């Protein structure tokens, strides 16, 4: 089987999809591995943290040219592997394939797009139809997404999730108590963790997205102190500079899809956390 995984990865690196048969296998084992992981997955540095990739496959290859190759460089992706980009299939499959091959070199969190309703509105579902010939590959992947960890904690200090803070979650234990094995709900803690956005207005605000909430500096400060965290590392929001600090540096947004939707002209960033948790950012333009 290992010799196989290696071949699949060599294939996917040429941007060539796997077959329905293989995807079904990649996913059955991927679930085996992801079921054992926690809602607040423990990750030890060193690790490079990445934000949205949204099927921009060639930008993902550019990301690896900048952060090193897996499994040499350890990676932590905070979700949003599909939709918008032109290669959702090759992108999510490569990442799921890197996970199954290297459980300890890669951590993949769940984003708001690793869900059933949204992927039928923004691409993934249709790309799958146009590339296989039926909805099976999409059922395999959206079923796998039910198992993705909603959060990761690096060295017990840096807390990583796709979206942000929830008014119905104050502790890391509260999150560990949630049943993540299910589709993303339209309301509640789990939804919030994948939909919320840090804001420059204090307290909790109404989210312009229609799900989750906006939270201000005061809420980040409280959540960081209450949980012995040095920082909240998230993504989900387009950041022209690739990455963005806010809330007096209790929060940083990392967006890894340069020129999002091939329309926004944003840089992308990736965040390196060395052996000592000292951090540094790498910014990049889209691959030529």
């Amino acid at each position: 089987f290992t010799k196989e995984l290696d071949q699949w990865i060599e294939q996917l690196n040429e941007c060539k999809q796997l077959s329905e048969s293989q995807v079904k296998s990649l996913c059955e084992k991927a679930k085996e591995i992801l079921t054992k992981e926690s809602n607040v997955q423990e990750v030890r540095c060193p690790v490079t943290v990445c934000g949205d990739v949204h099927g921009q496959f060639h930008d993902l290859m550019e990301l690896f040219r900048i952060g090193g190759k897996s499994p040499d460089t350890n990676y932590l992706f905070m979700g949003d592997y599909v939709d918008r980009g032109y290669y959702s299939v090759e992108t999510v499959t490569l990442l799921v394939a890197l996970k199954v091959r290297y459980r300890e070199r890669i951590t993949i969190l769940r984003g708001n797009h690793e869900s059933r309703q949204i992927t039928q509105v923004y691409g993934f579902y249709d790309e799958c139809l146009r590339k296989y010939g039926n909805a099976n590959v999409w059922k395999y992947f959206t079923d796998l997404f039910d198992y993705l960890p909603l959060t990761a904690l690096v060295d017990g200090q840096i807390f990583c999730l796709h979206g942000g803070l929830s008014p119905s979650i104050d502790t890391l234990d509260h999150i560990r108590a949630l049943d993540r094995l299910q589709e993303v709900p339209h309301e509640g803690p789990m939804c919030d963790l994948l939909w919320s956005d840090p804001d420059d207005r204090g307290g909790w605000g109404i989210s312009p997205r229609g799900a989750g909430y906006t939270f201000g500096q005061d809420i980040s400060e409280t959540f960081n102190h209450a949980n012995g965290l040095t920082l909240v590392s998230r993504a989900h929001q387009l950041v022209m500079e690739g990455y963005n600090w806010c809330h007096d540096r209790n929060v940083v947004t990392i967006f890894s899809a340069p020129n999002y939707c091939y329309r926004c002209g944003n840089q992308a960033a990736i965040m390196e956390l060395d052996d000592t948790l000292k951090y540094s950012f790498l910014q990049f333009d889209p691959a030529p």
């Binding site: 290992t2 060193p46 690896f64 040219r65 900048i66 952060g67 040499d72 300890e104 052996d275």
Partner: protein
């Protein structure tokens, strides 16, 4: 058939009197079975006709016939070789047509003067005055071998026929006559070069067909070398000047192409009077093909100006056009200029180079087209040997150091290629004092691709300076990274050891790198530990067997016990590939 000759025939296929190929080459031997008399009476006759276009066969037949004079009776009978050769000249696939002519030209010298007239010339005419055209495109190649040796009277006829071949109704017979007008010219007495060649030349230079005209440029080089300098202005230059002005850019292109040759054939004075302005026009041609060709000739041309007026024409007539070209729109042109522009240093001297060329040197070293800055970088030897390594370092270095640090990692990556070039060119003492630092710094760059490039770059530098230089100028600074708190750098250390074992030899690898590799087997980060297993696998073959048994086997075996899944996996693979398993 009949057996002495039937050995040539191929009775196995399904052809038309076809021959055995690996047998036509064994031809000089059937000619010994039957002797000279029988070779003439039945082998040549059999080869003359019986010509089935097996081509690769027709070719060998024409070649072989060119070394058959003696197998036929020696000189006195060489004409027995004409019939089958005349034949093969008129075939189709030109490769054969050529071999036929080359051979015909070879045995021409074997013909005695008397035999040339009785048999050779008659063959030239039949080909010249032939109906079919090929029979004429090949005749053109046979006039210069027989002209010198025949009678004054036959020379005349040979002149008429060659003329008729120049004003032939078919263009191809004209292009061929044109491309051979030069050599035929070299064998006529001067009077006839002035009275017959010149007119044919003028005529071909003003041909309706430009494919015929652009060929006349070559012919001009030849005719101009034969004529005394004083006759050039009246009999040639008007035509040559017109060619540089020709409506067809192809004709003009050929002028720039054969420029240096024209320069020599014409002489310093005319080059000063007529060619210097023409060269200037050509460097300003509207067609980028023509500008580029001319630019390519810049150094060669200036080198041949009469030492007398040299420097003053370059500074006054040539240099201004050159400043222009450095900024031309087409990269095709800037391309041609850069691959020679610095070759003008030893022709203007240290001071001139420093004030006038170095600026253009920079304008291109920071050009768009990478081929352009690469052509400048690939030719530093000459400028360096004219101005000082310090004067150069002082004008090149800031450019480099400014590109080694920059915006896109992509551009930084580009400057890394210049390294092995700069090394092999500017010297090892200069590399250790001004460049080594830069190459070390990239190993620790933020962007992985840069680190990678810089790493493989070490191998290419060692290929330039040697394993000893490596042990004293690079291995130490590379091993220093083993103690870096950041794993990205620690891994870079092994990646450098992997590439450097490919070229440092068993000694330096065993004594000076292996220990650092074995030592990291206890790194706190798993990525370093498994890359340690991968490194032993890589450098393993370079080590003698004793070392692999007492020092590697033990380490890998330990690593297979490691807590981490991947270190285990890679350790096992290492043991398996090396056979220590």
């Amino acid at each position: 058939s009949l057996y002495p000759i039937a050995v040539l025939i191929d009775e196995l296929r399904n052809e038309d009197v076809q021959l055995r190929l690996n047998s036509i080459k064994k031809l000089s031997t059937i000619a010994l079975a039957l002797g000279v008399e029988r070779t003439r009476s039945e082998l040549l006759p059999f080869l003359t006709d019986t010509i089935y276009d097996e081509d690769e066969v027709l070719l060998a037949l024409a070649e072989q016939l060119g070394t058959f004079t003696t197998l036929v009776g020696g000189p006195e009978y060489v004409h027995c070789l004409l019939p089958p050769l005349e034949s093969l000249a008129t075939v189709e696939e030109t490769v054969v047509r050529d071999k036929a002519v080359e051979s015909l030209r070879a045995i021409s010298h074997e013909h005695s003067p008397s035999d040339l007239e009785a048999h050779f010339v008659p063959l030239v005419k039949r080909l010249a005055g032939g109906d079919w055209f090929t029979s004429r495109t090949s005749a053109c190649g046979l006039f210069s071998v027989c002209y010198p040796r025949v009678s004054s009277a036959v020379k005349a006829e040979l002149r008429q026929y060659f003329r008729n071949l120049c004003s032939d109704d078919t263009p191809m017979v004209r292009r061929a006559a044109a491309s051979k007008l030069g050599e035929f010219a070299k064998v006529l007495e001067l009077d006839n070069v002035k009275s017959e060649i010149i007119p044919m030349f003028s005529n071909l230079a003003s041909d309706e067909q430009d494919s015929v005209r652009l060929l006349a440029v070559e012919a001009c080089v030849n005719i101009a070398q034969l004529l005394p300098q004083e006759d050039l202005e009246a009999l040639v230059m008007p035509t040559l000047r017109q060619a540089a002005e020709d409506k067809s850019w192809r004709v003009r292109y050929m002028v720039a192409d054969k420029f240096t040759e024209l320069q020599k054939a014409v002489g310093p004075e005319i080059t000063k009077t007529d060619l210097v302005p023409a060269f200037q026009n050509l460097m300003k041609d509207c067609e980028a093909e023509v500008r580029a060709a001319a630019s390519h000739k810049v150094k060669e041309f200036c080198e041949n100006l009469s030492a007398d007026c040299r420097e003053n024409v370059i500074m006054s007539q040539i240099l201004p056009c050159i400043k222009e070209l450095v900024s031309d729109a087409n990269q095709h042109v800037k391309s041609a200029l850069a691959s020679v522009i610095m070759g003008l240093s030893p022709i203007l001297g240290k001071d001139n180079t420093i004030e006038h060329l170095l600026p253009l040197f920079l304008a291109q070293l920071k050009d768009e087209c990478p081929e352009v800055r690469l052509n400048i970088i690939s030719n530093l030897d000459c400028v360096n040997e004219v101005i000082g390594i310090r004067q150069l370092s002082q004008s090149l270095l800031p450019a480099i150091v400014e590109l080694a640090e920059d915006a896109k990692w992509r551009v930084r990556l580009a400057i890394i290629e210049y390294m092995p070039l700069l090394a092999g060119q500017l010297g090892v003492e200069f590399f250790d004092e001004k460049l080594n630092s830069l190459c070390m710094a990239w190993l620790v760059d933020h962007v992985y691709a840069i680190r990678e490039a810089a790493t493989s770059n070490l191998k290419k530098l060692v290929e330039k300076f040697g394993k000893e230089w490596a042990h004293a100028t690079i291995i130490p600074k590379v091993l220093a990274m083993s103690g870096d708190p950041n794993y990205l750098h620690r891994m870079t250390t092994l990646f450098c050891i992997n590439v450097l074992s490919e070229v440092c030899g068993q000694d330096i690898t065993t004594k000076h790198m292996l220990p650092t590799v074995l030592r990291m087997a206890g790194d706190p980060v798993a990525n370093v530990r498994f890359n340690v297993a991968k490194s032993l696998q890589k450098i393993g073959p370079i080590l003698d067997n004793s070392t692999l048994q007492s020092e590697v086997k033990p380490i890998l075996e330990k690593l297979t016990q490691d807590q981490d899944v991947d270190v285990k996996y890679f350790a096992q693979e290492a043991l398996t590939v090396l056979s220590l398993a």
